[PDB]
C-alpha cells in the first residue's frame, strides 16, 4: 500500500485514509517496522478505514 | 471568378477549422465531454492537453 501514497493514486488508503494532491511538492518516506510494531502472535492494533 | 475565389477560400478555411474539431490529436476521443465524463481528472488533464 506504500505504492498508493503517491499523487494521482487510487485504492482504499489513498481514497479513504490519506490522499495526496495532484500537484504534490514534497517527499514520501517509508521503512520496515516489522521488528518494532509487529508483536509475536500477530499485531492487530493498527486500524485502517 | 475573382470574387467567387475569396468567398470560397474563406468558406473552405472555416470548414477545415471546424473539421479539425473531429480529430483525435493523440487523444482517446475527439469529444472532450467524453473524457471529462469518463476519465479521472489526473488523466483527463493529459487527455485534454
Tab-separated table of N, CA and C in Angstrom:
chain	number	residue	atom	x	y	z
A	1	UNK	N	0.793	-1.218	0.000
A	1	UNK	CA	0.000	0.000	0.000
A	1	UNK	C	0.830	1.275	0.000
A	2	UNK	N	2.135	1.192	0.274
A	2	UNK	CA	3.002	2.360	0.147
A	2	UNK	C	2.980	2.895	-1.277
A	3	UNK	N	2.872	2.006	-2.265
A	3	UNK	CA	2.751	2.426	-3.657
A	3	UNK	C	1.567	3.362	-3.877
A	4	UNK	N	0.545	3.304	-3.021
A	4	UNK	CA	-0.614	4.178	-3.154
A	4	UNK	C	-0.427	5.542	-2.500
A	5	UNK	N	0.593	5.720	-1.662
A	5	UNK	CA	0.872	7.025	-1.073
A	5	UNK	C	1.651	7.845	-2.093
A	6	UNK	N	1.001	8.167	-3.205
A	6	UNK	CA	1.598	8.937	-4.285
A	6	UNK	C	0.498	9.744	-4.953
A	7	UNK	N	0.843	10.843	-5.622
A	7	UNK	CA	-0.191	11.647	-6.285
A	7	UNK	C	-0.852	10.887	-7.422
A	8	UNK	N	-2.148	11.139	-7.592
A	8	UNK	CA	-2.904	10.517	-8.660
A	8	UNK	C	-3.234	9.060	-8.447
A	9	UNK	N	-3.032	8.538	-7.243
A	9	UNK	CA	-3.227	7.125	-6.964
A	9	UNK	C	-4.641	6.856	-6.458
A	10	UNK	N	-5.022	5.580	-6.487
A	10	UNK	CA	-6.335	5.127	-6.052
A	10	UNK	C	-6.166	3.892	-5.177
A	11	UNK	N	-7.236	3.520	-4.489
A	11	UNK	CA	-7.210	2.438	-3.526
A	11	UNK	C	-7.693	2.881	-2.155
A	12	UNK	N	-7.867	1.880	-1.287
A	12	UNK	CA	-8.531	2.098	-0.004
A	12	UNK	C	-7.855	3.197	0.809
A	13	UNK	N	-6.529	3.139	0.938
A	13	UNK	CA	-5.839	4.133	1.754
A	13	UNK	C	-5.806	5.482	1.049
A	14	UNK	N	-5.544	5.487	-0.256
A	14	UNK	CA	-5.484	6.752	-0.977
A	14	UNK	C	-6.849	7.427	-1.029
A	15	UNK	N	-7.914	6.647	-1.211
A	15	UNK	CA	-9.244	7.236	-1.318
A	15	UNK	C	-9.833	7.612	0.039
A	16	UNK	N	-9.625	6.794	1.076
A	16	UNK	CA	-10.345	6.981	2.327
A	16	UNK	C	-9.471	7.243	3.546
A	17	UNK	N	-8.150	7.116	3.445
A	17	UNK	CA	-7.272	7.326	4.592
A	17	UNK	C	-6.358	8.532	4.423
A	18	UNK	N	-5.567	8.573	3.356
A	18	UNK	CA	-4.608	9.653	3.154
A	18	UNK	C	-4.487	9.903	1.661
A	19	UNK	N	-4.897	11.089	1.221
A	19	UNK	CA	-4.970	11.434	-0.193
A	19	UNK	C	-3.962	12.534	-0.498
A	20	UNK	N	-3.086	12.281	-1.470
A	20	UNK	CA	-2.113	13.292	-1.853
A	20	UNK	C	-2.595	14.074	-3.069
A	21	UNK	N	-2.321	15.376	-3.112
A	21	UNK	CA	-2.846	16.207	-4.198
A	21	UNK	C	-2.147	15.919	-5.515
A	22	UNK	N	-2.840	16.270	-6.602
A	22	UNK	CA	-2.308	16.031	-7.941
A	22	UNK	C	-0.964	16.720	-8.140
A	23	UNK	N	-0.792	17.907	-7.565
A	23	UNK	CA	0.425	18.698	-7.718
A	23	UNK	C	1.271	18.717	-6.445
A	24	UNK	N	1.394	17.565	-5.790
A	24	UNK	CA	2.168	17.479	-4.560
A	24	UNK	C	3.618	17.874	-4.808
A	25	UNK	N	4.177	18.656	-3.887
A	25	UNK	CA	5.586	19.048	-3.924
A	25	UNK	C	6.202	18.695	-2.576
A	26	UNK	N	6.902	17.568	-2.510
A	26	UNK	CA	7.394	17.089	-1.232
A	26	UNK	C	7.951	15.686	-1.356
A	27	UNK	N	8.083	15.013	-0.212
A	27	UNK	CA	8.672	13.682	-0.172
A	27	UNK	C	7.826	12.728	0.660
A	28	UNK	N	7.817	11.463	0.246
A	28	UNK	CA	7.199	10.367	0.981
A	28	UNK	C	8.290	9.374	1.359
A	29	UNK	N	8.360	9.045	2.645
A	29	UNK	CA	9.420	8.248	3.236
A	29	UNK	C	8.780	7.042	3.906
A	30	UNK	N	9.395	5.873	3.755
A	30	UNK	CA	8.839	4.660	4.333
A	30	UNK	C	9.964	3.690	4.657
A	31	UNK	N	9.778	2.929	5.734
A	31	UNK	CA	10.776	1.932	6.104
A	31	UNK	C	10.148	0.820	6.932
A	32	UNK	N	10.852	-0.313	6.952
A	32	UNK	CA	10.361	-1.549	7.551
A	32	UNK	C	10.274	-1.440	9.066
A	33	UNK	N	9.057	-1.563	9.587
A	33	UNK	CA	8.789	-1.515	11.015
A	33	UNK	C	8.557	-2.898	11.610
A	34	UNK	N	8.776	-3.957	10.824
A	34	UNK	CA	8.368	-5.306	11.212
A	34	UNK	C	8.895	-5.702	12.584
A	35	UNK	N	10.072	-5.206	12.963
A	35	UNK	CA	10.645	-5.568	14.253
A	35	UNK	C	9.976	-4.832	15.408
A	36	UNK	N	9.716	-3.533	15.249
A	36	UNK	CA	9.175	-2.743	16.351
A	36	UNK	C	7.664	-2.903	16.498
A	37	UNK	N	6.915	-2.742	15.405
A	37	UNK	CA	5.463	-2.677	15.524
A	37	UNK	C	4.798	-4.048	15.556
A	38	UNK	N	5.404	-5.065	14.953
A	38	UNK	CA	4.778	-6.380	14.877
A	38	UNK	C	5.171	-7.206	16.094
A	39	UNK	N	4.169	-7.727	16.794
A	39	UNK	CA	4.363	-8.488	18.017
A	39	UNK	C	4.083	-9.965	17.775
A	40	UNK	N	4.721	-10.812	18.589
A	40	UNK	CA	4.523	-12.252	18.483
A	40	UNK	C	3.058	-12.579	18.726
A	41	UNK	N	2.492	-13.415	17.860
A	41	UNK	CA	1.076	-13.704	17.896
A	41	UNK	C	0.211	-12.755	17.100
A	42	UNK	N	0.803	-11.954	16.218
A	42	UNK	CA	0.052	-11.015	15.408
A	42	UNK	C	-0.193	-9.677	16.074
A	43	UNK	N	0.062	-8.591	15.345
A	43	UNK	CA	-0.179	-7.235	15.833
A	43	UNK	C	-1.441	-6.724	15.145
A	44	UNK	N	-2.549	-6.725	15.883
A	44	UNK	CA	-3.840	-6.279	15.380
A	44	UNK	C	-4.233	-4.898	15.900
A	45	UNK	N	-3.266	-4.100	16.358
A	45	UNK	CA	-3.596	-2.829	16.990
A	45	UNK	C	-3.793	-1.691	15.993
A	46	UNK	N	-3.182	-1.765	14.812
A	46	UNK	CA	-3.280	-0.692	13.829
A	46	UNK	C	-4.468	-0.914	12.903
A	47	UNK	N	-5.308	0.108	12.776
A	47	UNK	CA	-6.570	0.026	12.056
A	47	UNK	C	-6.527	0.901	10.811
A	48	UNK	N	-7.264	0.490	9.782
A	48	UNK	CA	-7.396	1.287	8.575
A	48	UNK	C	-8.851	1.283	8.127
A	49	UNK	N	-9.298	2.432	7.622
A	49	UNK	CA	-10.683	2.661	7.230
A	49	UNK	C	-10.916	2.234	5.788
B	1	UNK	N	-14.927	34.956	-61.304
B	1	UNK	CA	-14.047	34.084	-60.544
B	1	UNK	C	-13.266	34.810	-59.468
B	2	UNK	N	-12.853	36.048	-59.748
B	2	UNK	CA	-12.043	36.780	-58.782
B	2	UNK	C	-12.828	37.098	-57.519
B	3	UNK	N	-14.153	37.193	-57.620
B	3	UNK	CA	-14.991	37.424	-56.451
B	3	UNK	C	-15.414	36.127	-55.784
B	4	UNK	N	-15.620	35.074	-56.572
B	4	UNK	CA	-16.012	33.789	-56.015
B	4	UNK	C	-14.867	33.146	-55.249
B	5	UNK	N	-13.627	33.399	-55.676
B	5	UNK	CA	-12.480	32.724	-55.079
B	5	UNK	C	-12.297	33.101	-53.616
B	6	UNK	N	-12.544	34.362	-53.258
B	6	UNK	CA	-12.320	34.773	-51.875
B	6	UNK	C	-13.371	34.167	-50.948
B	7	UNK	N	-14.642	34.192	-51.355
B	7	UNK	CA	-15.684	33.589	-50.530
B	7	UNK	C	-15.473	32.083	-50.421
B	8	UNK	N	-15.056	31.432	-51.514
B	8	UNK	CA	-14.786	30.001	-51.445
B	8	UNK	C	-13.611	29.704	-50.525
B	9	UNK	N	-12.562	30.528	-50.574
B	9	UNK	CA	-11.408	30.300	-49.713
B	9	UNK	C	-11.769	30.483	-48.246
B	10	UNK	N	-12.604	31.475	-47.931
B	10	UNK	CA	-12.993	31.660	-46.537
B	10	UNK	C	-13.924	30.548	-46.066
B	11	UNK	N	-14.853	30.117	-46.922
B	11	UNK	CA	-15.722	29.005	-46.557
B	11	UNK	C	-14.916	27.734	-46.334
B	12	UNK	N	-13.909	27.493	-47.175
B	12	UNK	CA	-13.078	26.307	-47.016
B	12	UNK	C	-12.221	26.394	-45.761
B	13	UNK	N	-11.693	27.581	-45.451
B	13	UNK	CA	-10.912	27.737	-44.229
B	13	UNK	C	-11.769	27.498	-42.995
B	14	UNK	N	-13.018	27.964	-43.011
B	14	UNK	CA	-13.899	27.691	-41.879
B	14	UNK	C	-14.269	26.214	-41.811
B	15	UNK	N	-14.493	25.585	-42.966
B	15	UNK	CA	-14.853	24.172	-42.986
B	15	UNK	C	-13.731	23.314	-42.423
B	16	UNK	N	-12.491	23.581	-42.836
B	16	UNK	CA	-11.370	22.830	-42.278
B	16	UNK	C	-11.157	23.163	-40.806
B	17	UNK	N	-11.371	24.422	-40.405
B	17	UNK	CA	-11.235	24.765	-38.994
B	17	UNK	C	-12.211	23.970	-38.136
B	18	UNK	N	-13.453	23.822	-38.601
B	18	UNK	CA	-14.432	23.048	-37.844
B	18	UNK	C	-14.101	21.562	-37.898
B	19	UNK	N	-13.687	21.065	-39.067
B	19	UNK	CA	-13.305	19.663	-39.197
B	19	UNK	C	-12.110	19.302	-38.326
B	20	UNK	N	-11.270	20.274	-37.968
B	20	UNK	CA	-10.196	19.993	-37.022
B	20	UNK	C	-10.703	19.715	-35.615
B	21	UNK	N	-11.992	19.925	-35.347
B	21	UNK	CA	-12.551	19.516	-34.065
B	21	UNK	C	-12.809	18.019	-34.024
B	22	UNK	N	-13.031	17.406	-35.183
B	22	UNK	CA	-13.238	15.966	-35.320
B	22	UNK	C	-11.932	15.202	-35.451
B	23	UNK	N	-10.902	15.585	-34.703
B	23	UNK	CA	-9.584	14.980	-34.826
B	23	UNK	C	-9.046	14.645	-33.446
B	24	UNK	N	-8.497	13.438	-33.309
B	24	UNK	CA	-8.054	12.950	-32.007
B	24	UNK	C	-6.834	13.709	-31.496
B	25	UNK	N	-5.851	13.961	-32.365
B	25	UNK	CA	-4.595	14.608	-31.975
B	25	UNK	C	-3.898	13.833	-30.861
B	26	UNK	N	-4.007	12.509	-30.895
B	26	UNK	CA	-3.385	11.685	-29.883
B	26	UNK	C	-4.236	11.425	-28.660
B	27	UNK	N	-5.468	11.919	-28.630
B	27	UNK	CA	-6.375	11.678	-27.520
B	27	UNK	C	-7.243	10.455	-27.793
B	28	UNK	N	-7.708	9.831	-26.710
B	28	UNK	CA	-8.566	8.658	-26.794
B	28	UNK	C	-9.914	8.934	-27.446
B	29	UNK	N	-10.296	10.200	-27.612
B	29	UNK	CA	-11.547	10.523	-28.288
B	29	UNK	C	-11.549	11.994	-28.672
B	30	UNK	N	-12.418	12.327	-29.628
B	30	UNK	CA	-12.497	13.692	-30.131
B	30	UNK	C	-13.346	14.586	-29.239
B	31	UNK	N	-14.384	14.035	-28.618
B	31	UNK	CA	-15.324	14.815	-27.821
B	31	UNK	C	-14.763	14.913	-26.409
B	32	UNK	N	-14.394	16.128	-25.998
B	32	UNK	CA	-13.823	16.319	-24.669
B	32	UNK	C	-14.831	16.010	-23.573
B	33	UNK	N	-16.129	16.124	-23.873
B	33	UNK	CA	-17.142	15.785	-22.881
B	33	UNK	C	-17.028	14.329	-22.453
B	34	UNK	N	-16.594	13.451	-23.360
B	34	UNK	CA	-16.465	12.042	-23.011
B	34	UNK	C	-15.255	11.791	-22.123
B	35	UNK	N	-14.162	12.527	-22.329
B	35	UNK	CA	-13.006	12.364	-21.455
B	35	UNK	C	-13.296	12.940	-20.077
B	36	UNK	N	-13.949	14.101	-20.018
B	36	UNK	CA	-14.271	14.676	-18.715
B	36	UNK	C	-15.322	13.857	-17.973
B	37	UNK	N	-16.236	13.200	-18.692
B	37	UNK	CA	-17.254	12.367	-18.065
B	37	UNK	C	-16.804	10.936	-17.798
B	38	UNK	N	-15.699	10.487	-18.388
B	38	UNK	CA	-15.295	9.092	-18.272
B	38	UNK	C	-13.946	8.879	-17.602
B	39	UNK	N	-13.030	9.837	-17.677
B	39	UNK	CA	-11.702	9.676	-17.108
B	39	UNK	C	-11.545	10.517	-15.848
B	40	UNK	N	-10.698	10.038	-14.943
B	40	UNK	CA	-10.398	10.789	-13.735
B	40	UNK	C	-9.588	12.035	-14.086
B	41	UNK	N	-9.808	13.147	-13.385
B	41	UNK	CA	-9.081	14.390	-13.681
B	41	UNK	C	-7.579	14.172	-13.812
B	42	UNK	N	-6.925	13.362	-12.918
B	42	UNK	CA	-5.477	13.164	-13.063
B	42	UNK	C	-5.037	12.710	-14.448
B	43	UNK	N	-5.935	12.069	-15.193
B	43	UNK	CA	-5.671	11.669	-16.569
B	43	UNK	C	-6.443	12.482	-17.591
B	44	UNK	N	-7.599	13.024	-17.203
B	44	UNK	CA	-8.308	13.944	-18.079
B	44	UNK	C	-7.464	15.167	-18.401
B	45	UNK	N	-6.601	15.596	-17.477
B	45	UNK	CA	-5.712	16.719	-17.763
B	45	UNK	C	-4.807	16.409	-18.949
B	46	UNK	N	-4.228	15.208	-18.961
B	46	UNK	CA	-3.309	14.835	-20.028
B	46	UNK	C	-4.067	14.607	-21.326
B	47	UNK	N	-5.257	14.007	-21.244
B	47	UNK	CA	-6.034	13.799	-22.462
B	47	UNK	C	-6.543	15.109	-23.056
B	48	UNK	N	-6.854	16.104	-22.222
B	48	UNK	CA	-7.258	17.405	-22.748
B	48	UNK	C	-6.077	18.128	-23.381
B	49	UNK	N	-4.905	18.098	-22.733
B	49	UNK	CA	-3.753	18.829	-23.262
B	49	UNK	C	-3.518	18.515	-24.739
